[PDB]
Amino acid sequence: PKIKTVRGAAKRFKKTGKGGFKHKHANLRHILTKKATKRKRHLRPKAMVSKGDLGLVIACLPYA
Amino acid sequence: GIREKIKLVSSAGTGHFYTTTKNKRTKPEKLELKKFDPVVRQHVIYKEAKI
Amino acid sequence: GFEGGQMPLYRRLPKFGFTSRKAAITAEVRLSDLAKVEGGVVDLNTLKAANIIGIQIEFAKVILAGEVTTPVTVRGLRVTKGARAAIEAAGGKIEE
Amino acid sequence: TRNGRDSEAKRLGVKRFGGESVLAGSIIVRQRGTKFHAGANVGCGRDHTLFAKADGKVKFEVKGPKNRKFISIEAE
RNA sequence: CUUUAAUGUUUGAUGUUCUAACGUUGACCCGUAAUCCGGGUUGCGGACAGUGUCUGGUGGGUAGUUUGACUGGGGCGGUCUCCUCCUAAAGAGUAACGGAGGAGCACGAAGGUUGGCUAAUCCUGGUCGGACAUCAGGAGGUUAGUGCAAUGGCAUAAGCCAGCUUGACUGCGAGCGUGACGGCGCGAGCAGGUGCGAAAGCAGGUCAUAGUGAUCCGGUGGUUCUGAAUGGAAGGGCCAUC
RNA sequence: GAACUCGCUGUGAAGAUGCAGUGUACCCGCGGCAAGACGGAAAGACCCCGUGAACCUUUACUAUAGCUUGACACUGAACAU
RNA sequence: GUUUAUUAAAAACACAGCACUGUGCAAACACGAAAGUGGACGUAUACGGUGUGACGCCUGCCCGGUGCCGGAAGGUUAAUU
RNA sequence: AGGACCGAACCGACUAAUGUUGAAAAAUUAGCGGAUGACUUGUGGCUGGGGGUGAAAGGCCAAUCAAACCGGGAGAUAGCU
RNA sequence: UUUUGUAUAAUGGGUCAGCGACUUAUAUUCUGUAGCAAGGUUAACCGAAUAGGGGAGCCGAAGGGAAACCGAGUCUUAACU
Ligand SMILES: [Mg+2]
Ligand SMILES: [Mg+2]
Ligand SMILES: [Mg+2]
Ligand SMILES: [Mg+2]
Ligand SMILES: [Mg+2]
Ligand SMILES: [Mg+2]
Ligand SMILES: [Mg+2]
Ligand SMILES: [Mg+2]
Ligand SMILES: [Mg+2]
Ligand SMILES: [Mg+2]
Ligand SMILES: [Mg+2]
Ligand SMILES: [Mg+2]
Ligand SMILES: [Mg+2]
Ligand SMILES: [Mg+2]
Ligand SMILES: [Mg+2]
Ligand SMILES: [Mg+2]
Ligand SMILES: [Mg+2]
Ligand SMILES: [Mg+2]
Ligand SMILES: [Mg+2]
Ligand SMILES: [Mg+2]
Ligand SMILES: [Mg+2]
Ligand SMILES: [Mg+2]
Ligand SMILES: [Mg+2]
Ligand SMILES: [Mg+2]
Ligand SMILES: [Mg+2]
Ligand SMILES: [Mg+2]
Ligand SMILES: [Mg+2]
Ligand SMILES: [Mg+2]
Ligand SMILES: [Mg+2]
Ligand SMILES: [Mg+2]
Ligand SMILES: [Mg+2]
Ligand SMILES: [Mg+2]
Ligand SMILES: [Mg+2]
Ligand SMILES: [Mg+2]
Ligand SMILES: [Mg+2]
Ligand SMILES: [Mg+2]
Ligand SMILES: [Mg+2]
Ligand SMILES: [Mg+2]
Ligand SMILES: [Mg+2]
Ligand SMILES: [Mg+2]
Ligand SMILES: [Mg+2]
Ligand SMILES: [Mg+2]
Ligand SMILES: [Mg+2]
Ligand SMILES: [Mg+2]
Ligand SMILES: [Mg+2]
Ligand SMILES: [Mg+2]
Ligand SMILES: [Mg+2]
Ligand SMILES: [Mg+2]
Ligand SMILES: [Mg+2]
Ligand SMILES: [Mg+2]
Ligand SMILES: [Mg+2]
Ligand SMILES: [Mg+2]
Ligand SMILES: [Mg+2]
Ligand SMILES: [Mg+2]
Ligand SMILES: [Mg+2]
Ligand SMILES: [Mg+2]
Ligand SMILES: [Mg+2]
Ligand SMILES: [Mg+2]
Ligand SMILES: [Mg+2]
Ligand SMILES: [Mg+2]
Ligand SMILES: [Mg+2]
Ligand SMILES: [Mg+2]
Ligand SMILES: [Mg+2]
Ligand SMILES: [Mg+2]
Ligand SMILES: [Mg+2]
Ligand SMILES: [Mg+2]
Ligand SMILES: [Mg+2]
Ligand SMILES: [Mg+2]
Ligand SMILES: [Mg+2]
Ligand SMILES: [Mg+2]
Ligand SMILES: [Mg+2]
Ligand SMILES: [Mg+2]
Ligand SMILES: [Mg+2]
Ligand SMILES: [Mg+2]
Ligand SMILES: [Mg+2]
Ligand SMILES: [Mg+2]
Ligand SMILES: [Mg+2]
Ligand SMILES: [Mg+2]
Ligand SMILES: [Mg+2]
Ligand SMILES: [Mg+2]
Ligand SMILES: [Mg+2]
Ligand SMILES: [Mg+2]
Ligand SMILES: [Mg+2]
Ligand SMILES: [Mg+2]
Ligand SMILES: [Mg+2]
Ligand SMILES: [Mg+2]
Ligand SMILES: [Mg+2]
Ligand SMILES: [Mg+2]
Ligand SMILES: [Mg+2]
Ligand SMILES: [Mg+2]
Ligand SMILES: [Mg+2]
Ligand SMILES: [Mg+2]
Ligand SMILES: [Mg+2]
Ligand SMILES: [Mg+2]
Ligand SMILES: [Mg+2]
Ligand SMILES: [Mg+2]
Ligand SMILES: [Mg+2]
Ligand SMILES: [Mg+2]
Ligand SMILES: [Mg+2]
Ligand SMILES: [Mg+2]
Ligand SMILES: [Mg+2]
Ligand SMILES: [Mg+2]
Ligand SMILES: [Mg+2]
Ligand SMILES: [Mg+2]
Ligand SMILES: [Mg+2]
Ligand SMILES: [Mg+2]
Ligand SMILES: [Mg+2]
Ligand SMILES: [Mg+2]
Ligand SMILES: [Mg+2]
Ligand SMILES: [Mg+2]
Ligand SMILES: [Mg+2]
Ligand SMILES: [Mg+2]
Ligand SMILES: [Mg+2]
Ligand SMILES: [Mg+2]
Ligand SMILES: [Mg+2]
Ligand SMILES: [Mg+2]
Ligand SMILES: [Mg+2]
Ligand SMILES: [Mg+2]
Ligand SMILES: [Mg+2]
Ligand SMILES: [Mg+2]
Ligand SMILES: [Mg+2]
Ligand SMILES: [Mg+2]
Ligand SMILES: [Mg+2]
Ligand SMILES: [Mg+2]
């Protein structure tokens, strides 16, 4: 039958204009007083998925 | 550790704040500092409060 | 997604965002699709009869994508600044 | 026994050698303490890292009354 | 407002009595040719006992499961994350239940800047005062000092004193180092607003390297976002934090 | 598995009828004995492993029959405290 | 006297006797969603459970721990309102 | 008189030898225990599997028992050979 | 066959003949090939039609932002060299 999407993966990745994926950085939910403001500033924007992980992400999102 | 977290609430009424630590046994005086409030873009007085 | 027991990638990263219900009743229209209507009056109902937008669509926009030659009238739809300059140069008009 | 544990290696040492062409902002050496000191067009970081403030060629020389080592940049 | 006796009000409870629900594995009559069952007369109890829904306690009687890895075989013992030195073969990296030690913090000053300053130890003289206290002179040259292990540094001091202070600042960032990845680190320069100094300048915590915990879930404050017929609201998103 | 199926010393997946060197030996039955063919008869029961079973125990975890407490319903009438 | 039919007949089980404990009869207890039935057409000189094991001489100290029995002045505490 | 004594039929099973591709999927030969009793035997009946029955060995329930046999979920699952 | 390594005294086979193990369906991505091309293609269904009709739909031609929204740009920020 039809393939089923991993519904928890669709909540975390978005496909961009050349076939890449963007995600949200980690380490910015929790325990924020002891972290430096320079470190927290650099974790605010979004980043792209690396080459090693593209194979695992694409398998989880067949209809993306 | 035995130090505890506090926060510095701005007096300009904007609602902005900072966070830092303190030990309340050897220094019971309230902390007061002049810092930069980014909502009003000025340096103003901040005062101790509770997390 | 299995990796041997290490926490997988789609589970050690945070979630974000929400889904907009108004984005599924909005469409965009091109300058090249602007001459396929009947009568030269570009309207929401004229675009549906031309198989240009979907039946459930309620809002539409015209963008600078393609070429426009004939003079046409746009009634009730949003237009960019770039598309508005090109429509006028062909002898058309935009009336909201 | 009561031995058994160590720590990770930090990958210190020289990254650019004499005569190399570098861009401004690149790192010449990583160190604990100033075993090399900063010369012309070279800055010192908070962890005693030396980096290029312009672009040119890396240079090593011994100078001063204590025979210490310096790193400089010879701009083009 | 203090405590008071009382008309009458809503009751709540604790006993007594009653019979009419309900119980009878007491006696008698009938269906009947019957130690089941049903109907009738009478005695004994009686709103109790007993049963349905909900609820606190007990419950290996019964049921479903869990009870780590490394390891000169397994068990017992020891270890499991982070920092420093050796092994490690003069770039980086490099194993063993190999050889030696530390961390799970501290500090609104022990942070910033301006001005100034230089150690341990020994000898001689000197009231109490002595091997060792404070004072004076001489030799010596860092053999001292770093908030806490070890290593690399430190006199232009990063070590020791004062005055003024909050840069332990908000938005970014050319270019580099290190990781399979998640991630971690260094950084001139630009915009706004500050402190010290006459200025040139310096300041985005502390001589550097340990002092730490992903995601899910929930809490607190703020918001030019969203709001299932419409106007609100509930809920969600974004920013700060637990 | 197929055989034209000797001893010794060495070697070798480390205890050889079959490899190397060497010694002995005409072809084939019958009655006997058990030293070897790591002889035959059961995918070792000892030991360890698998995020395999089964039964038993308890102050291991989570539940539950049974037992027990109270409120409401079947359930009414007076009187005095 | 009994026991592992098919590797164990024994010092193991049972026994007459002794003690503790529950039960007033629609008895306690047991089989059953229930109706019913055994106990028993019996009635504390009776019936059920547990331990010890003819007979003779005997059976000493501990209630702090675990279990069980009795009490309710006070503290905490469910559904309900 | 007697859960008395010796000993056949009858009911058992303590020792040795044989057999162990047996005459026999538990026997034969020579000895051995009880033999009026808690004895032994014929015909019919009742108790059903997480259940029964057990003078108690985890014993027995059709040569099968720390959970009988037949059919189904079912081509259960097998990081192992 | 399995192994670092087997003439191994490690596993399997007495021999012959017959049979005996990478499949089918539906989705998705890549390569070769054919048609048509800013376009490509129909499903159920109708039709006696392997013809013809049916364009409901799907993919592509525009992206950025959590979203409102803007659009060859957009987001970030009071604003960007
Ligand atoms: Mg947050
Ligand atoms: Mg789609
Ligand atoms: Mg784990
Ligand atoms: Mg359409
Ligand atoms: Mg080691
Ligand atoms: Mg190492
Ligand atoms: Mg040089
Ligand atoms: Mg009566
Ligand atoms: Mg009856
Ligand atoms: Mg009465
Ligand atoms: Mg009464
Ligand atoms: Mg009651
Ligand atoms: Mg048990
Ligand atoms: Mg159990
Ligand atoms: Mg299970
Ligand atoms: Mg182990
Ligand atoms: Mg051991
Ligand atoms: Mg060994
Ligand atoms: Mg070994
Ligand atoms: Mg070893
Ligand atoms: Mg080992
Ligand atoms: Mg073990
Ligand atoms: Mg061990
Ligand atoms: Mg252990
Ligand atoms: Mg080296
Ligand atoms: Mg080397
Ligand atoms: Mg070296
Ligand atoms: Mg190597
Ligand atoms: Mg190695
Ligand atoms: Mg100075
Ligand atoms: Mg030191
Ligand atoms: Mg230290
Ligand atoms: Mg220092
Ligand atoms: Mg200082
Ligand atoms: Mg000034
Ligand atoms: Mg520090
Ligand atoms: Mg300091
Ligand atoms: Mg330090
Ligand atoms: Mg360190
Ligand atoms: Mg180091
Ligand atoms: Mg509304
Ligand atoms: Mg809200
Ligand atoms: Mg031959
Ligand atoms: Mg032969
Ligand atoms: Mg011969
Ligand atoms: Mg030979
Ligand atoms: Mg030989
Ligand atoms: Mg030999
Ligand atoms: Mg040969
Ligand atoms: Mg030979
Ligand atoms: Mg040869
Ligand atoms: Mg030979
Ligand atoms: Mg030869
Ligand atoms: Mg002959
Ligand atoms: Mg012969
Ligand atoms: Mg012979
Ligand atoms: Mg033999
Ligand atoms: Mg042989
Ligand atoms: Mg054998
Ligand atoms: Mg076997
Ligand atoms: Mg085992
Ligand atoms: Mg495992
Ligand atoms: Mg009532
Ligand atoms: Mg018997
Ligand atoms: Mg018998
Ligand atoms: Mg036997
Ligand atoms: Mg005996
Ligand atoms: Mg017995
Ligand atoms: Mg009694
Ligand atoms: Mg009765
Ligand atoms: Mg009876
Ligand atoms: Mg009877
Ligand atoms: Mg009994
Ligand atoms: Mg006994
Ligand atoms: Mg006796
Ligand atoms: Mg006696
Ligand atoms: Mg006695
Ligand atoms: Mg006693
Ligand atoms: Mg007691
Ligand atoms: Mg009590
Ligand atoms: Mg007799
Ligand atoms: Mg006799
Ligand atoms: Mg026997
Ligand atoms: Mg024989
Ligand atoms: Mg006999
Ligand atoms: Mg006899
Ligand atoms: Mg007898
Ligand atoms: Mg006798
Ligand atoms: Mg019979
Ligand atoms: Mg039965
Ligand atoms: Mg069973
Ligand atoms: Mg069952
Ligand atoms: Mg046993
Ligand atoms: Mg049988
Ligand atoms: Mg059984
Ligand atoms: Mg079972
Ligand atoms: Mg079966
Ligand atoms: Mg199934
Ligand atoms: Mg199978
Ligand atoms: Mg084989
Ligand atoms: Mg091997
Ligand atoms: Mg070989
Ligand atoms: Mg062979
Ligand atoms: Mg061998
Ligand atoms: Mg052989
Ligand atoms: Mg071998
Ligand atoms: Mg092997
Ligand atoms: Mg073998
Ligand atoms: Mg072989
Ligand atoms: Mg064989
Ligand atoms: Mg064949
Ligand atoms: Mg295949
Ligand atoms: Mg396959
Ligand atoms: Mg391909
Ligand atoms: Mg199609
Ligand atoms: Mg098709
Ligand atoms: Mg289709
Ligand atoms: Mg068709
Ligand atoms: Mg249809
Ligand atoms: Mg149709
Ligand atoms: Mg179409
Ligand atoms: Mg259609
Ligand atoms: Mg479709
Ligand atoms: Mg821009």
mmCIF file of N, CA, C and O (backbone and C1' of nucleotides) in Angstrom, chain I residues 45-75:
data_model
loop_
_atom_site.group_PDB
_atom_site.id
_atom_site.type_symbol
_atom_site.label_atom_id
_atom_site.label_comp_id
_atom_site.label_asym_id
_atom_site.label_seq_id
_atom_site.Cartn_x
_atom_site.Cartn_y
_atom_site.Cartn_z
ATOM 1 P P C I 45 -15.726 1.235 -12.798
ATOM 2 O "O5'" C I 45 -16.695 2.203 -13.609
ATOM 3 C "C5'" C I 45 -17.892 2.704 -13.031
ATOM 4 C "C4'" C I 45 -18.413 3.897 -13.790
ATOM 5 C "C3'" C I 45 -18.943 3.617 -15.187
ATOM 6 O "O3'" C I 45 -20.284 3.162 -15.172
ATOM 7 C "C1'" C I 45 -17.510 5.511 -15.229
ATOM 8 P P C I 46 -20.796 2.071 -16.234
ATOM 9 O "O5'" C I 46 -20.972 2.893 -17.583
ATOM 10 C "C5'" C I 46 -22.018 3.838 -17.735
ATOM 11 C "C4'" C I 46 -21.875 4.613 -19.021
ATOM 12 C "C3'" C I 46 -21.857 3.793 -20.300
ATOM 13 O "O3'" C I 46 -23.156 3.433 -20.734
ATOM 14 C "C1'" C I 46 -20.137 5.416 -20.364
ATOM 15 P P G I 47 -23.414 2.032 -21.473
ATOM 16 O "O5'" G I 47 -22.450 2.074 -22.740
ATOM 17 C "C5'" G I 47 -22.745 2.894 -23.859
ATOM 18 C "C4'" G I 47 -21.621 2.878 -24.863
ATOM 19 C "C3'" G I 47 -21.218 1.511 -25.389
ATOM 20 O "O3'" G I 47 -22.076 1.023 -26.405
ATOM 21 C "C1'" G I 47 -19.285 2.687 -24.748
ATOM 22 P P A I 48 -22.846 -0.373 -26.205
ATOM 23 O "O5'" A I 48 -21.705 -1.371 -25.724
ATOM 24 C "C5'" A I 48 -22.001 -2.705 -25.334
ATOM 25 C "C4'" A I 48 -20.993 -3.665 -25.909
ATOM 26 C "C3'" A I 48 -19.586 -3.107 -26.052
ATOM 27 O "O3'" A I 48 -18.837 -3.276 -24.866
ATOM 28 C "C1'" A I 48 -20.257 -4.149 -28.079
ATOM 29 P P A I 49 -17.804 -2.149 -24.392
ATOM 30 O "O5'" A I 49 -16.393 -2.698 -24.876
ATOM 31 C "C5'" A I 49 -15.507 -1.868 -25.615
ATOM 32 C "C4'" A I 49 -15.179 -2.467 -26.956
ATOM 33 C "C3'" A I 49 -13.927 -1.910 -27.621
ATOM 34 O "O3'" A I 49 -13.291 -2.947 -28.364
ATOM 35 C "C1'" A I 49 -15.794 -1.516 -29.008
ATOM 36 P P U I 50 -12.137 -3.833 -27.686
ATOM 37 O "O5'" U I 50 -10.977 -2.784 -27.393
ATOM 38 C "C5'" U I 50 -10.827 -2.180 -26.112
ATOM 39 C "C4'" U I 50 -9.400 -1.767 -25.859
ATOM 40 C "C3'" U I 50 -8.702 -1.088 -27.032
ATOM 41 O "O3'" U I 50 -7.766 -0.132 -26.540
ATOM 42 C "C1'" U I 50 -7.553 -3.073 -26.472
ATOM 43 P P A I 51 -8.185 1.407 -26.379
ATOM 44 O "O5'" A I 51 -8.876 1.770 -27.766
ATOM 45 C "C5'" A I 51 -8.098 2.055 -28.917
ATOM 46 C "C4'" A I 51 -8.954 2.566 -30.049
ATOM 47 C "C3'" A I 51 -9.497 3.978 -29.895
ATOM 48 O "O3'" A I 51 -8.565 4.972 -30.280
ATOM 49 C "C1'" A I 51 -11.241 2.530 -30.551
ATOM 50 P P G I 52 -8.435 6.332 -29.441
ATOM 51 O "O5'" G I 52 -9.933 6.854 -29.301
ATOM 52 C "C5'" G I 52 -10.540 7.625 -30.330
ATOM 53 C "C4'" G I 52 -11.995 7.903 -30.039
ATOM 54 C "C3'" G I 52 -12.289 8.812 -28.855
ATOM 55 O "O3'" G I 52 -12.136 10.188 -29.146
ATOM 56 C "C1'" G I 52 -13.679 6.921 -28.741
ATOM 57 P P G I 53 -11.597 11.197 -28.017
ATOM 58 O "O5'" G I 53 -12.780 11.266 -26.950
ATOM 59 C "C5'" G I 53 -13.942 12.045 -27.193
ATOM 60 C "C4'" G I 53 -15.060 11.727 -26.229
ATOM 61 C "C3'" G I 53 -14.934 12.281 -24.819
ATOM 62 O "O3'" G I 53 -15.290 13.648 -24.723
ATOM 63 C "C1'" G I 53 -15.640 10.026 -24.728
ATOM 64 P P G I 54 -14.577 14.611 -23.653
ATOM 65 O "O5'" G I 54 -14.728 13.852 -22.260
ATOM 66 C "C5'" G I 54 -15.915 13.957 -21.486
ATOM 67 C "C4'" G I 54 -15.770 13.291 -20.138
ATOM 68 C "C3'" G I 54 -14.663 13.821 -19.237
ATOM 69 O "O3'" G I 54 -15.034 14.998 -18.537
ATOM 70 C "C1'" G I 54 -14.588 11.460 -19.269
ATOM 71 P P G I 55 -14.350 16.414 -18.869
ATOM 72 O "O5'" G I 55 -12.929 16.362 -18.152
ATOM 73 C "C5'" G I 55 -12.825 16.255 -16.738
ATOM 74 C "C4'" G I 55 -11.498 16.748 -16.210
ATOM 75 C "C3'" G I 55 -11.120 18.193 -16.544
ATOM 76 O "O3'" G I 55 -10.483 18.779 -15.413
ATOM 77 C "C1'" G I 55 -9.386 16.750 -17.206
ATOM 78 P P A I 56 -11.349 19.507 -14.279
ATOM 79 O "O5'" A I 56 -11.835 18.318 -13.347
ATOM 80 C "C5'" A I 56 -13.192 18.220 -12.949
ATOM 81 C "C4'" A I 56 -13.343 17.333 -11.743
ATOM 82 C "C3'" A I 56 -12.227 17.419 -10.720
ATOM 83 O "O3'" A I 56 -12.338 18.552 -9.880
ATOM 84 C "C1'" A I 56 -12.755 15.153 -11.127
ATOM 85 P P G I 57 -11.020 19.239 -9.275
ATOM 86 O "O5'" G I 57 -10.328 18.056 -8.474
ATOM 87 C "C5'" G I 57 -8.936 18.059 -8.214
ATOM 88 C "C4'" G I 57 -8.383 16.660 -8.226
ATOM 89 C "C3'" G I 57 -6.870 16.555 -8.263
ATOM 90 O "O3'" G I 57 -6.284 16.686 -6.980
ATOM 91 C "C1'" G I 57 -7.789 15.153 -9.916
ATOM 92 P P C I 58 -5.115 17.755 -6.724
ATOM 93 O "O5'" C I 58 -3.802 16.983 -7.169
ATOM 94 C "C5'" C I 58 -3.529 15.682 -6.674
ATOM 95 C "C4'" C I 58 -2.475 14.987 -7.493
ATOM 96 C "C3'" C I 58 -1.221 15.791 -7.769
ATOM 97 O "O3'" C I 58 -0.322 15.804 -6.676
ATOM 98 C "C1'" C I 58 -1.951 14.766 -9.763
ATOM 99 P P C I 59 0.532 17.121 -6.347
ATOM 100 O "O5'" C I 59 1.710 17.095 -7.412
ATOM 101 C "C5'" C I 59 2.718 16.100 -7.361
ATOM 102 C "C4'" C I 59 3.526 16.063 -8.632
ATOM 103 C "C3'" C I 59 4.250 17.339 -9.015
ATOM 104 O "O3'" C I 59 5.431 17.577 -8.273
ATOM 105 C "C1'" C I 59 3.180 16.466 -10.913
ATOM 106 P P G I 60 5.838 19.079 -7.882
ATOM 107 O "O5'" G I 60 6.168 19.770 -9.276
ATOM 108 C "C5'" G I 60 7.305 19.385 -10.029
ATOM 109 C "C4'" G I 60 7.415 20.155 -11.319
ATOM 110 C "C3'" G I 60 7.373 21.668 -11.223
ATOM 111 O "O3'" G I 60 8.580 22.248 -10.767
ATOM 112 C "C1'" G I 60 6.005 20.966 -13.000
ATOM 113 P P A I 61 8.540 23.652 -9.989
ATOM 114 O "O5'" A I 61 8.291 24.722 -11.135
ATOM 115 C "C5'" A I 61 9.240 24.908 -12.171
ATOM 116 C "C4'" A I 61 8.663 25.692 -13.322
ATOM 117 C "C3'" A I 61 8.196 27.101 -13.011
ATOM 118 O "O3'" A I 61 9.251 28.039 -12.914
ATOM 119 C "C1'" A I 61 6.545 26.014 -14.271
ATOM 120 P P A I 62 9.207 29.179 -11.785
ATOM 121 O "O5'" A I 62 9.777 28.471 -10.475
ATOM 122 C "C5'" A I 62 8.905 28.016 -9.445
ATOM 123 C "C4'" A I 62 9.325 28.518 -8.086
ATOM 124 C "C3'" A I 62 8.218 28.528 -7.038
ATOM 125 O "O3'" A I 62 8.803 28.469 -5.738
ATOM 126 C "C1'" A I 62 8.933 30.718 -7.400
ATOM 127 P P G I 63 9.205 27.089 -5.023
ATOM 128 O "O5'" G I 63 10.276 27.549 -3.940
ATOM 129 C "C5'" G I 63 11.564 28.001 -4.331
ATOM 130 C "C4'" G I 63 11.901 29.364 -3.767
ATOM 131 C "C3'" G I 63 11.835 29.529 -2.260
ATOM 132 O "O3'" G I 63 12.957 28.983 -1.592
ATOM 133 C "C1'" G I 63 10.842 31.399 -3.308
ATOM 134 P P G I 64 12.854 28.535 -0.054
ATOM 135 O "O5'" G I 64 12.661 29.898 0.746
ATOM 136 C "C5'" G I 64 13.725 30.824 0.885
ATOM 137 C "C4'" G I 64 13.320 32.026 1.700
ATOM 138 C "C3'" G I 64 12.746 31.753 3.076
ATOM 139 O "O3'" G I 64 13.738 31.448 4.040
ATOM 140 C "C1'" G I 64 11.445 33.396 1.985
ATOM 141 P P G I 65 13.415 30.450 5.254
ATOM 142 O "O5'" G I 65 12.323 31.218 6.117
ATOM 143 C "C5'" G I 65 12.684 32.267 7.000
ATOM 144 C "C4'" G I 65 11.469 32.912 7.615
ATOM 145 C "C3'" G I 65 10.584 32.022 8.468
ATOM 146 O "O3'" G I 65 11.097 31.803 9.769
ATOM 147 C "C1'" G I 65 9.238 33.310 7.022
ATOM 148 P P A I 66 11.044 30.344 10.432
ATOM 149 O "O5'" A I 66 9.494 29.978 10.438
ATOM 150 C "C5'" A I 66 9.046 28.643 10.624
ATOM 151 C "C4'" A I 66 7.743 28.597 11.385
ATOM 152 C "C3'" A I 66 6.582 29.377 10.784
ATOM 153 O "O3'" A I 66 5.868 28.634 9.810
ATOM 154 C "C1'" A I 66 6.784 29.887 13.086
ATOM 155 P P A I 67 5.486 29.290 8.398
ATOM 156 O "O5'" A I 67 4.240 30.237 8.705
ATOM 157 C "C5'" A I 67 2.989 29.719 9.141
ATOM 158 C "C4'" A I 67 2.187 30.767 9.880
ATOM 159 C "C3'" A I 67 1.783 31.993 9.072
ATOM 160 O "O3'" A I 67 0.586 31.800 8.342
ATOM 161 C "C1'" A I 67 2.774 32.686 11.099
ATOM 162 P P A I 68 0.330 32.606 6.980
ATOM 163 O "O5'" A I 68 -0.089 34.065 7.453
ATOM 164 C "C5'" A I 68 -1.427 34.360 7.830
ATOM 165 C "C4'" A I 68 -1.533 35.728 8.456
ATOM 166 C "C3'" A I 68 -1.348 36.912 7.520
ATOM 167 O "O3'" A I 68 -2.527 37.254 6.813
ATOM 168 C "C1'" A I 68 -0.006 37.215 9.432
ATOM 169 P P C I 69 -2.532 37.322 5.208
ATOM 170 O "O5'" C I 69 -1.181 38.078 4.830
ATOM 171 C "C5'" C I 69 -1.008 39.467 5.075
ATOM 172 C "C4'" C I 69 0.451 39.849 5.060
ATOM 173 C "C3'" C I 69 1.089 39.980 3.688
ATOM 174 O "O3'" C I 69 0.836 41.234 3.079
ATOM 175 C "C1'" C I 69 2.476 38.663 5.068
ATOM 176 P P C I 70 0.748 41.365 1.481
ATOM 177 O "O5'" C I 70 2.267 41.358 1.001
ATOM 178 C "C5'" C I 70 3.165 42.387 1.385
ATOM 179 C "C4'" C I 70 4.601 42.000 1.133
ATOM 180 C "C3'" C I 70 4.968 41.668 -0.301
ATOM 181 O "O3'" C I 70 5.160 42.806 -1.117
ATOM 182 C "C1'" C I 70 5.860 40.022 1.119
ATOM 183 P P G I 71 4.772 42.745 -2.672
ATOM 184 O "O5'" G I 71 5.741 41.639 -3.278
ATOM 185 C "C5'" G I 71 7.123 41.899 -3.486
ATOM 186 C "C4'" G I 71 7.861 40.646 -3.882
ATOM 187 C "C3'" G I 71 7.576 40.122 -5.281
ATOM 188 O "O3'" G I 71 8.394 40.761 -6.249
ATOM 189 C "C1'" G I 71 7.416 38.351 -3.706
ATOM 190 P P A I 72 8.172 40.544 -7.826
ATOM 191 O "O5'" A I 72 9.299 39.492 -8.236
ATOM 192 C "C5'" A I 72 10.512 39.904 -8.864
ATOM 193 C "C4'" A I 72 11.714 39.670 -7.978
ATOM 194 C "C3'" A I 72 13.074 39.940 -8.619
ATOM 195 O "O3'" A I 72 13.971 40.429 -7.621
ATOM 196 C "C1'" A I 72 13.000 37.717 -7.866
ATOM 197 P P G I 73 13.870 41.938 -7.078
ATOM 198 O "O5'" G I 73 12.661 41.903 -6.040
ATOM 199 C "C5'" G I 73 12.885 41.757 -4.646
ATOM 200 C "C4'" G I 73 12.367 40.436 -4.135
ATOM 201 C "C3'" G I 73 12.216 40.316 -2.627
ATOM 202 O "O3'" G I 73 10.991 40.853 -2.157
ATOM 203 C "C1'" G I 73 13.358 38.421 -3.460
ATOM 204 P P U I 74 10.940 41.734 -0.817
ATOM 205 O "O5'" U I 74 10.963 40.665 0.364
ATOM 206 C "C5'" U I 74 9.940 39.690 0.503
ATOM 207 C "C4'" U I 74 10.419 38.503 1.303
ATOM 208 C "C3'" U I 74 10.863 38.798 2.727
ATOM 209 O "O3'" U I 74 9.781 38.826 3.641
ATOM 210 C "C1'" U I 74 12.494 37.470 1.639
ATOM 211 P P C I 75 9.886 39.646 5.017
ATOM 212 O "O5'" C I 75 10.867 38.786 5.926
ATOM 213 C "C5'" C I 75 10.462 37.557 6.507
ATOM 214 C "C4'" C I 75 11.626 36.847 7.154
ATOM 215 C "C3'" C I 75 12.288 37.564 8.315
ATOM 216 O "O3'" C I 75 11.600 37.367 9.538
ATOM 217 C "C1'" C I 75 13.940 36.710 6.839
#
